[PDB]
Design a protein around this ligand. Structure first.
Ligand SMILES: COc1ccccc1Nc1cc2[nH]c(-c3cnco3)cc2cn1
Length: 255
């Protein structure tokens, strides 16, 4: 019923999808009755460092459009001193809500999603971006295809420590993203993150960095999937598999 204008084009709001601090995401319809997602950002209480982090992220989203379809489509935007309006493609659901709603995941679906995550994250690395806070909430299902929605640049399932690499707890390398992606895949395999059993956040951080804390990798029919997991979840980033290596791995390549 409500409406909004973005670069002269009018959009009618269908429903609110997301909500950040000063941001809101809405499912909308244009004049041609085409569906889109509009992200609204209130810049009223935003300082210069915040504004520039927002502008840097918008520029990377706009640039990386061309380089990969595993990155969310950004059709247009309007930016003033009071607000940002971002016209994007609308997803069906984020990966976190999908993983929470669905109990068991198909191995084919899992493999397909993993490929998409690698392609998206690989793309940002080729441009010098290390996300450093990947979690299922950063991925959107858009027509049986996972797409990355953000680059971790803009000032921010927020707070979560379950996908955090041991090197990030000690303190900035593409290997940090590999650990996080490994945690997402571990969740899509075992239905839990590697340290989800630890309630206490301090004890949890202690176990992620603890080399004497053996991560369990229960036996599964996909031995190649178990290997990817063991390779991503190597505490020493030097011993950790890289994205180009993950793309050549049997799990992703072999039918
Ligand atoms: C029906 O739409 C959804 C329902 C539940 C969760 C997600 C979606 N779809 C959606 C959510 C979105 N969030 C962003 C976004 C937030 N920050 C940058 O892009 C784009 C987007 C595009 N489509």
């Amino acid at each position: 019923f409500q409406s909004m204008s973005v670069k002269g084009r009018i959009y009618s709001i269908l429903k609110q999808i997301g909500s950040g601090g000063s941001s809101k995401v809405f499912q909308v319809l244009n004049e041609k009755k085409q569906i889109y997602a509009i992200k609204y950002v209130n810049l009223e209480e935003a300082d210069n460092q915040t504004l520039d982090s927002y502008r840097n992220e918008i520029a990377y989203l706009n640039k990386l459009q061309q380089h990969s379809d595993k990155i969310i489509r950004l059709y247009d935007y309007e930016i003033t001193d009071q607000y940002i309006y971002m016209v994007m493609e609308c997803g069906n659901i984020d990966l976190n809500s999908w993983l929470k709603k669905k109990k068991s995941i198909d191995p084919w679906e899992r493999k397909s999603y993993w490929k998409n995550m690698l392609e998206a994250v690989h793309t940002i690395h080729q441009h010098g971006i290390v996300h450093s806070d990947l979690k299922p909430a950063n991925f959107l299902i858009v027509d049986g295809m996972l797409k990355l929605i953000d680059f971790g640049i803009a000032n921010q399932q927020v707070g979560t420590v379950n996908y955090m690499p041991p090197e990030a707890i000690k303190d900035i390398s593409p290997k940090s993203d590999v650990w996080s992606l490994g945690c997402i895949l571990y969740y899509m395999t075992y239905g839990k993150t590697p340290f989800q059993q630890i309630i206490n956040q301090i004890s949890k951080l202690h176990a992620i960095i603890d080399p004497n804390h053996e991560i369990e990798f229960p036996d599964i029919p996909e031995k190649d999937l178990q290997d990817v997991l063991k390779c991503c979840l190597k505490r020493d980033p030097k011993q950790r598999i890289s994205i180009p290596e993950l793309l050549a791995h049997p799990y992703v390549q072999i039918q």
